[PDB]
Write a protein that binds this ligand. Structure first.
Ligand code: CD4
Ligand code: BCL
Ligand code: BCL
Ligand code: BPH
Ligand code: BPH
Ligand SMILES: *[C@H]1O[C@H](CO)[C@@H](O[C@@H]2O[C@@H](C)[C@H](O)[C@@H](O)[C@H]2O)[C@H](O)[C@@H]1O[C@H]1O[C@H](C(=O)O)[C@@H](O[C@H]2O[C@H](CO)[C@@H](O)[C@H](O)[C@H]2NC(C)=O)[C@H](OC(C)=O)[C@H]1OC(C)=O
Ligand SMILES: *[C@H]1O[C@H](CO)[C@@H](O[C@@H]2O[C@@H](C)[C@H](O)[C@@H](O)[C@H]2O)[C@H](O)[C@@H]1O[C@H]1O[C@H](C(=O)O)[C@@H](O[C@H]2O[C@H](CO)[C@@H](O)[C@H](O)[C@H]2NC(C)=O)[C@H](OC(C)=O)[C@H]1OC(C)=O
Ligand code: V7N
Ligand code: V7N
Ligand code: CRT
Ligand code: LMT
Ligand code: FE
Lengths: 48, 273, 177, 71, 62, 323, 40, 71, 60, 60, 39, 39, 39, 60, 39
């Protein structure tokens, strides 16, 4: 890619480990653990 | 030829089989009945390996490859040119390794030693027998054995690992690796400690059990003692081979999925499912 | 949709209609028309994958409206995007010495490894089904199934880019990611 | 019943009892915290009718033919 | 511009020459006890010849 | 477990006062203090640097499960602190994208070096040879190649992640990237010494326990004043395999086999991706690779069709296919 | 090291009242829990 | 207040203190060096109005790429 | 009840108490912090009606 | 309450205290620095009216 | 170890300190509940 | 150990140092609150 | 160990060194704040 | 000040100091040599106006 | 160990070496600043 656009923060993984999608998340489907996989929504207080 | 103290020890007795007939030496080597059977199996098994190299594609030492039979032959003897030769060499190897251990028991008995050395070597024989007898038997074909070739058996190890996608996740394999690595650390420490008291800096008195005891306690926070460090080395080294034998025998006969998905039980404990 | 369930797609009084009496579109019929074109495209252009076994609606749907293995956008580094807009999984050098040709990272090998575990599980096979793992790059040492697998990647990219992903405006929002 | 404390040292038994109860209490809370119906940190303010209930038996002919969600 | 010779091969023979030097050294150390060997037709040293038997200086306490 | 010497089965003994003229002395062998576990200045500093390294690793792992302490334990072996992204090369990366990694790696490395200083100083103070510090140096050499090989290829992204299963993912991927590490001859040597260390300690451990009832475990006495226990150990191996060590020299064989495991290991890593990028092809060149019959044959048309592409960047957009 | 029967009598009285007080708190807790969100 | 030095050996306190201060100073410098706003070796010449603000986004850069070209 | 301190060394049990309470409090704070509703570092300024609530049972 | 310093050696207690406070302070700062709202090195000059809040933007 | 006089005196502090801690925690729960109730 | 008046002397410093530390932390928290409230 | 007079002498240097170090750090923060404020 | 050398043996402090300075100098040189702006072996002959600078803020 | 007068003798060299080192470093920094200033 010629330049990098950041994804929205809710599409950014908290876990930087490269195989985690195959080695863990392919079998782990606990609800709370699933929610923790991505950063939560974050907004300037102006926009609420 | 004999060590300058040796002749005194070369008595009869201690043989398990054959009485006095084979109770003699050939140069440094003790013979005995299992000495005779060792040389029989070593010679036959070696010459069949040379024949396997002759009928194979090359004489290059690294590339020689005596493969087991196809799985379709099951527990039968294949045609010799199609893996049957590997089976005969395997019977020779078992005969040789067994004879070697029993010959060591005769030597230890003749010197008034305990049996520790034969039993320690039994741990290596167990791992071999697991790789070529027990696991192939539980899978129902001798063709599950590893080929006899210096690099071709490493191709077998590679492919068996990836049969389970990510063999590092094998739980018994993690234990076996931990024993192998801890053994190498313990060997370095024990070797260094003995040498450093017996070979101090120039112009320094020879050290003592007290100094190595003090230094070892500074390293691990406890004093293992002289008998304990040899017990620990034997425990680590033999335990490594036993856990190796476990880790391969569970792979296939018992677990057939990828090893990462074995850990699903840990994720599903009821405290945190 | 289950046998005899023509009502799943149709205004059963007017099979020719693509809308309900309310004028709202029969989205299921509009999808199924595209699914016919997709199935013909699979069977016709990707015979190097499906050969004379071929596919029908039952292959994915198996009697149900939703197939298995549905996936949606998530992370950028999600390996399933190998089946959509990405190309290139190779990381191994085709030569002894290092070069400027291959500057792949060990992280990129980890990404290929994650992708390949997914494919192995998808077929219930292990790596030796498609590789001799003494050299993953080798085709000669690999079984012929590796060649079929490669055409499967090319097929999924066409299926996803040209048929499934552009159905976005047809679906109800409950079906979307 | 007080003779039981002649037979077992109360120093051991009181420690063992407290340890047993502490572990049991922790286990039960973490089991509940990992359930959906009693994930009380997230959903404790829901009324009892609103709280999750695990899936029933099919409780029907178990054979039914679907109809699409409205567009 | 050497095709066959490469740095890894060079390193490996450097190691082999070191390693066989180490084995010679270790076999000399193995022979500080019980050598020269006894036989008919006299003493035998083996190969390599052993290093001499080693005296150890005790610590004084007077 | 039960044991084949009485020595500590029963009638173990208490020195109620100290030994060294259970209990412990408070005094000196020369200038070396004998009571507490030794630290000195280097030991104290090593613990501080190493504590912060471990603390940074743990806190990043815990942040990666969103501070959830249940998931921190449940998922612990899958958690990692991960190296920087490849595009940065050797430049300083963002804090949440490998900046904490390089910081923990730095503090861990200093902590290891300071622990070597500690051991070196303590060996001198106890009036001992430096064999143990140089043994430990061989381990530090292998460890250091996980810094120098990434440096020589030019990217911190190639470093080992801190994490139980993640560092094993790296270990597999490193072998995949560089075309099967089994064909790295220094890896093969390192295995030969690793196995030989288990062979030797099995043999030596069993040997000394087999003569322990004759005082064979008192190896320093047997080295300085050879008893029958040493003689019987030499003769067992001479009669078994035709040659033998001494009570002293078996510890040299032990020392070198352990040391050469990590020394040859380190060279093999340094050669990888700097001199050889595909070890299997290096194996073909030098004649290591056994021939197998071909499992498939490609046409010239397939040879161009099946060429892949080298892996690139992930897509940084979520394309709409609306058309 | 020991325990007298007289001392045991005294100890047992506390042990019972401690157990009973604990059981009472647990009983109130369960009824609060039940009236908040019944499990049957 | 000085009796704290009877309570602890100052020879040991000063080593631990210097170690603590060294580690704390090194942490803060590497933290700043890894930030956008304070990466002073690359960007120290920027004026205070020109320095970054915000950019707390966890993934500021692409995780996955080849190595830079290797001449 | 004070005779309990004749059975148990008050010095040992008091340390055991402080160690227990510290770890318990830390677990509870991190359980709350990692929840949606009580992620107070990010969302503490929200009013109680604005704060998250976990999903109900699916509506009829 | 100075008799607690008869019960416990202040040399040990005061080290254990300083250790606990140092580790706790490091943990709290690391948590805040890892957050969005208190990512203060990158965003500390933002006014409170436009500092991040952990909530989704309105209007779905 | 302790005399019964020490045990009697220790118990007075230990009980009062326990109840003081519980009182402080009660206000903390009062403040937390006022800010964001969990039922 | 230490004498009881020596423990009295030590306690005065511990109370003073604690109060000093709590005061500094209170000012630190109030600065932080004025900069960016967390409730 | 150490004597009271020796501990008192040491404490003078230790306090003075600590406060001198804090002053130098105060100036380094003055310089950093002037170059690029963090609030 | 000089009485510090009675408390600490200068044989040891000098050796520790020389090592600390050597490692510190190595770290700083390596950090600069790895940087874009100060990679002086490749780019040392560039003028100050030609040397790299890290990106100015769009503040987006 | 040293005597106090020997410690005073050593200290005078230690200060002088530290000053010499700081001088050389300061010239090195001012050269580096003139070649490529970091602020
Ligand atoms: C890869 C990493 C790990 C790899 C790990 C590798 C570990 C290697 C461990 C084994 C090495 C030690 C073996 C040993 O010393 O045996 C004793 C024997 C004889 O010397 P002696 O014991 O002091 O004296 C006795 C003798 O003089 C008189 O005895 P006697 O009259 O009763 O009996 C007849 C003689 C006849 O000699 C022989 O039959 C032996 C000839 C073959 C020796 C080959 C040794 C292995 C070389 C390996 C290096 C390399 C060779 C190319 O003596 C005997 O009967 C003695 C029988 C000894 C049988 C030992 C067999 C060992 C086989 C080892 C195979 C190793 C495979 C790896 O020694 C020798 O013959 C000389 C060996 C010297 C060490 C090899 C050094 C090579 C350096 C490089 C080349 C040097 C060129 C000059
Ligand atoms: C798919 C996987 C690959 C593979 C990939 C690799 C890679 C990659 C490496 C090895 C390496 C090794 N492999 Mg291999 N390996 C495979 C298959 C095998 C097989 C087998 C039966 O198949 C075996 C027996 C081995 C054996 C070995 C060893 C000989 C060698 C490590 C030596 C050592 O002691 O390391 C263990 C010792 C250390 C790591 C030293 C550590 C010392 C430091 C100082 C300890 C610091 C601790 C610190 C104070 C505290 C830490 C705190 C925490 C950070 C919190 N591999 C296949 C082919 N292998 C290494 C090597 O040398 O390669 C040439 C290596 O890097
Ligand atoms: C050693 C002395 C006793 C004691 C003796 C008294 C006396 C005497 C009185 C109270 C009173 C009260 N005590 Mg009480 N109280 C003690 C321990 C406690 C503890 C505890 C955690 O141990 C708590 C929560 C309380 C709580 C209370 C309140 C219910 C009440 C007044 C408010 C208050 O808290 O003031 C703050 C107090 C505290 C946090 C406790 C510590 C301070 C001292 C010991 C008690 C306050 C003395 C009060 C100012 C005296 C005024 C007398 C005038 C004639 C009006 N006490 C100790 C053990 N307490 C008063 C009452 O009944 O009001 C209706 C009252 O007259
Ligand atoms: C307890 C576990 C560890 C262990 C211990 C151990 N090994 C031991 C002992 C002990 C305690 C001995 O006493 C014994 C000995 O005498 O050592 C000098 C031995 C020994 N360990 C040996 C090797 C060895 N040990 C290994 C491993 C282990 N040894 C474990 C790690 C390995 C590995 C991992 O690769 C090897 C290669 C021998 C040096 C020796 C046993 C000698 C013996 O049995 O001699 C009789 C047989 C022959 C001389 C040759 C037989 C030839 C065959 C008939 C034909 C070839 C068949 C073979 C299968 C071909 C394989 C080709 C390969 C390329 C695959
Ligand atoms: C010859 C090769 C083998 C080898 C050898 C070897 N390793 C060694 C040695 C030797 C000879 C040592 O002497 C040395 C050692 O100490 O051994 C006990 C060491 C060592 N090998 C180690 C590990 C190790 N070795 C390994 C491998 C190997 N070691 C090889 C197989 C492996 C593997 C296989 O992965 C590991 C993990 C260590 C146990 C040890 C070096 C210890 C060290 O450097 O520690 C640094 C310090 C820390 C990480 C910090 C710890 C922090 C505490 C947990 C915090 C507690 C709080 C603290 C008190 C706060 C501060 C307050 C201050 C006021 C004090
Ligand atoms: C759904 O809507 C489409 C609208 O295109 C209808 O398709 C028509 O009929 C097909 C046979 C033909 O192929 C197609 O070209 C088109 O002419 C489809 O039949 C469905 O019809 C129902 O809903 C229609 C709708 O759009 O709302 C409705 O159409 C009528 O009413 C709308 C206004 O509400 C007006 O725009 C249309 O022009 C009008 N059409 C006619 C022919 O009157 C249909 O009502 C009628 C009477 O046709 C609906 O059909 C029925 C039976 O309910
Ligand atoms: C969103 O954009 C990214 C970044 O371009 C795309 O990812 C690219 O493609 C992947 C194979 C690769 O993994 C990645 O490194 C990157 O190269 C991603 O697939 C999405 O693509 C769409 O948007 C592209 C975009 O960059 O805007 C767009 O690209 C084309 O148009 C732009 C704008 O005019 C131009 O800058 C690009 O050079 C141009 N590229 C090409 C190859 O035409 C894509 O359009 C096309 C036809 O590729 C978009 O793709 C789709 C299907 O919408
Ligand atoms: C992300 O957020 C999560 C983490 C999730 C949120 C949760 C957080 C949690 C659970 C927090 C819990 C905090 C806590 C709990 O208790 C916190 C406790 C804090 C406390 C008690 C602090 C006390 C400090 C006391 C100090 C500094 C004392 C100094 C004393 C000095 C200086 C004097 C020394 C003596 C001298 C000078 C002379 C002696 C005389 C002598 C010798 C003589 O005269 O001889
Ligand atoms: C991640 O951030 C990054 C990027 C890394 C950035 C941040 C970096 C940081 C935090 C840096 C910190 C630096 C620092 C902190 O204090 C640095 C402190 C430095 C210091 C104190 C240096 C002192 C040097 C002193 C010297 C050289 C003295 C030499 C003395 C000599 C030669 C004479 C010896 C005596 C003699 C000859 C007489 C014998 C007579 C005898 C015996 C007799 O007469 O008896
Ligand atoms: C509150 O406290 C908590 C609870 C957080 C404490 C708990 C912590 C926990 C649970 C920690 C768990 C840790 C685990 C499980 C760690 C696992 C580690 C493993 C398995 C590591 C394996 C391998 C790692 C390797 C080989 C790393 C090597 C790194 C190196 C060599 C880095 C070197 C960096 C250097 C030399 C310098 C960097 C700085 C620059 C580049 C700028 O140069 C100056
Ligand atoms: C002292 C080095 C401090 C480095 C920090 C920057 C300089 C700041 C202080 C400069 C002024 C001198 O500082 C002052 O030195 C004197 C001795 O000279 C020390 O004096 C100390 O030792 C002397 C004896 O030597 C005692 O009589 C005195 O009671 C005690 O306080 C003081 O504790 C310190 O406050
Ligand atoms: Fe030994």
């Amino acid at each position: 890619g010629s330049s990098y656009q950041q994804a929205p923060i809710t599409n950014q993984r908290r876990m930087r480990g490269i195989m985690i999608q195959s080695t863990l998340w392919d079998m782990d489907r606990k609800r709370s653990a699933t929610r923790q996989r991505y950063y939560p929504a974050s907004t300037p207080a102006n926009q609420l | 030829a004999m060590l300058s103290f040796e002749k005194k020890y070369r008595v009869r007795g201690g043989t398990l089989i054959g009485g006095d007939l084979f109770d003699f030496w050939f140069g440094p080597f003790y013979v005995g009945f299992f000495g005779v059977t060792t040389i029989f199996f070593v010679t036959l098994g070696t010459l069949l390996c040379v024949w396997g190299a002759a009928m194979g594609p090359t004489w290059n030492l690294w590339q020689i490859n005596i493969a087991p039979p196809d799985l379709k032959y099951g527990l039968g003897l294949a045609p010799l040119r199609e893996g049957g030769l590997w089976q005969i060499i395997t019977l020779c190897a078992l005969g040789a390794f067994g004879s070697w251990a029993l010959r060591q028991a005769e030597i230890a008995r003749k010197l008034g030693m305990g049996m520790h050395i034969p039993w320690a070597y039994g741990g290596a024989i167990l791992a071999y027998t697991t790789l070529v007898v027990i696991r192939p038997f539980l899978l129902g074909a001798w063709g599950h054995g590893f080929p006899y070739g210096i690099f071709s058996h490493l191709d077998w190890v590679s492919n068996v690992g990836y049969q389970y996608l990510h063999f590092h996740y094998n739980p018994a394999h993690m234990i076996a690796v931990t024993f192998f690595f801890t053994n190498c650390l313990a060997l370095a420490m024990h070797g260094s400690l003995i040498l450093s008291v017996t070979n101090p800096p120039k112009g320094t008195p020879t050290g003592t059990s007290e100094q190595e005891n003090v230094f070892f306690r500074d390293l691990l926070g406890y004093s293992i003692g002289a008998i304990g460090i040899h017990r620990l080395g034997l425990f680590l080294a033999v335990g490594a081979a036993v856990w190796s034998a476990i880790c391969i025998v569970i792979s296939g006969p018992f677990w057939t999925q990828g090893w990462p998905e074995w850990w699903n039980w840990w994720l599903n404990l009821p405290i945190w499912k | 949709a289950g046998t005899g369930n023509c009502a799943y797609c149709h205004n059963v009084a007017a099979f020719q209609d693509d809308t309900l009496p309310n004028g709202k579109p029969l989205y299921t019929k509009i999808v199924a028309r595209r699914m016919l074109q997709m199935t013909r495209n699979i069977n016709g252009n990707y015979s190097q994958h499906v050969k004379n076994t071929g596919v029908t609606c039952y292959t994915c749907h198996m009697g149900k409206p939703l197939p298995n293995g549905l996936w949606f956008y998530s992370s950028q580094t999600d390996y399933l995007r190998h089946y959509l807009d990405r190309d290139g999984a190779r990381v191994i050098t085709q030569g002894v010495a290092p070069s400027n040709a291959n500057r792949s990272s060990t992280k990129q090998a980890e990404w290929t490894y994650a992708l390949m575990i997914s494919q192995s599980r998808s077929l219930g096979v292990n790596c030796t089904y498609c590789h001799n793992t003494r050299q993953f790059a080798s085709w000669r040492e690999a079984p012929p199934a590796r060649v079929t697998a490669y055409h499967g990647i090319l097929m999924l990219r066409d299926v996803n880019q040209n048929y499934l992903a552009p159905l976005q405006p047809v679906y109800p929002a409950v079906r979307l990611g | 019943m007080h003779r039981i404390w002649l037979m077992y040292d109360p120093r051991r038994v009181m420690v063992a009892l407290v340890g047993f109860l502490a572990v049991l209490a922790l286990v039960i809370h973490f089991v509940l915290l990992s359930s959906q119906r009693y994930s009380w940190i997230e959903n404790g303010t829901l009324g009892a009718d609103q709280a999750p209930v695990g899936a029933s038996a099919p409780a029907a002919a178990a054979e039914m033919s679907p109809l699409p969600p409205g567009r | 511009m050497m095709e066959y010779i490469d740095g890894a091969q060079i390193a490996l023979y450097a190691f082999w020459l070191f390693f066989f030097g180490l084995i010679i050294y270790l076999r000399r150390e193995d022979k500080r006890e019980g050598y020269p060997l006894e036989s008919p037709q006299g003493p035998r040293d083996g190969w390599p010849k052993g290093a001499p038997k080693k005296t150890y200086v005790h610590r004084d306490h007077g | 477990m039960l044991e084949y010497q009485n020595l500590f089965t029963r009638v173990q003994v208490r020195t109620v006062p100290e030994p060294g003229i259970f209990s412990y002395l408070a005094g000196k062998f020369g200038d070396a203090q004998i009571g507490p576990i030794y630290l000195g200045w280097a030991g104290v500093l090593s613990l501080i640097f190493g504590f912060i390294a471990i603390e940074i690793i743990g806190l990043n792992m815990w942040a990666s499960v969103g501070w959830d302490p249940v998931e921190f334990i449940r998922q612990l072996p899958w958690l990692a602190l991960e190296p920087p992204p490849p595009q940065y090369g050797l430049r300083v990366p963002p804090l949440n994208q490998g900046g904490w990694y390089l910081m923990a790696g730095f503090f861990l490395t200093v902590s290891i070096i300071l622990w070597w200083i500690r051991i070196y100083r303590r060996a001198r103070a106890l009036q001992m040879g430096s064999h143990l510090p140089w043994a430990f140096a061989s381990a530090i050499f292998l460890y250091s190649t996980f810094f120098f090989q990434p440096l020589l290829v030019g990217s911190w992204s190639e470093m080992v992640p801190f994490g139980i299963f993640p560092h094993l993912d790296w270990t597999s991927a490193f072998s995949i990237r560089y075309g099967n590490l089994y064909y790295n001859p220094f890896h093969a040597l390192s295995i030969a010494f690793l196995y030989g260390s288990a062979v030797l300690f099995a043999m030596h451990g069993a040997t000394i326990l087999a003569v322990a009832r004759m005082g064979g475990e008192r190896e320093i006495e047997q080295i300085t004043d050879r008893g029958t226990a040493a003689e019987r150990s030499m003769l067992f191996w001479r009669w078994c395999m035709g040659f033998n060590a001494t009570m002293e020299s078996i510890h040299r064989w032990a020392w070198w086999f352990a040391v050469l495991t990590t020394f040859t290991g380190g060279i093999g890593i340094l050669l990888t991706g700097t001199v050889v990028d595909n070890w299997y092809l290096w194996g073909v060149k030098h004649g290591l690779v056994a021939p197998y019959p071909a499992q498939n044959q490609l046409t010239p048309e397939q040879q161009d069709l099946l060429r892949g592409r080298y892996q690139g960047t992930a897509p940084d957009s979520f394309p709409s296919y609306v058309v | 090291g020991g325990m007298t029967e007289e001392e045991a009598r005294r100890f047992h009285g506390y042990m019972v009242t401690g157990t009973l007080g604990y059981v009472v708190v647990a009983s109130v807790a369960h009824f609060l829990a039940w009236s908040w969100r019944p499990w049957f």
